[PDB]
């Protein structure tokens, strides 16, 4: 302790990153927002990006099922990552106007 600055011990650590040719297993924390029910908004449920309304559904999903498509290969339902609730993705209200 009689030694001044420069001679005192300093614990030094180095978080050396590799980024090798392998499936990435060490990522960073991802922020999670709230969930509106009756509101056409943007959704990003685990990679699944799109627009539409996120309402409840009665489709009984299996435990390993996460996403859900329709007959025309269109995402119709999705399972929330945090809570095991199976929603119903319906597109935003659209149409065609004629004057």
């Amino acid at each position: 302790p009689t030694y001044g600055v420069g001679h005192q011990p300093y614990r030094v650590v180095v978080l050396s990153f590799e980024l090798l040719h392998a499936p990435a297993t060490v990522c960073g924390p991802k922020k999670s927002t709230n969930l509106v029910k009756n509101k056409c908004v943007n959704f990003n449920f685990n990679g699944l990006k799109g627009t539409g309304v996120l309402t409840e559904s009665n489709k009984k999903f299996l435990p390993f099922q996460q996403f859900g498509r329709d007959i025309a290969d269109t995402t119709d339902a999705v399972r929330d990552p945090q809570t095991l609730e199976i929603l119903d993705i319906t597109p935003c209200s659209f149409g065609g106007v004629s004057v």
């Binding site: 990006k49 799109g50 025309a72 290969d73």
Partner: protein, 49 residues
């Protein structure tokens, strides 16, 4: 008996089941989903795909 009327109904149905099927076909690209193209390549090559 009503096969001639079912013909135009099935022909107008298979023509609509083909357009919704070709939306997933990769017309010589990296993927079909447009959100995936704009999330795994660079802008100068994103418009190429």
């Amino acid at each position: 008996a009503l096969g001639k009327l079912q013909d135009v109904v099935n022909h107008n149905a298979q023509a609509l089941n083909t357009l919704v099927k070709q939306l997933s076909s990769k017309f010589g690209a990296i993927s079909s989903v447009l959100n995936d193209i704009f999330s795994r390549l660079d802008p100068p090559e994103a418009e190429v795909q």
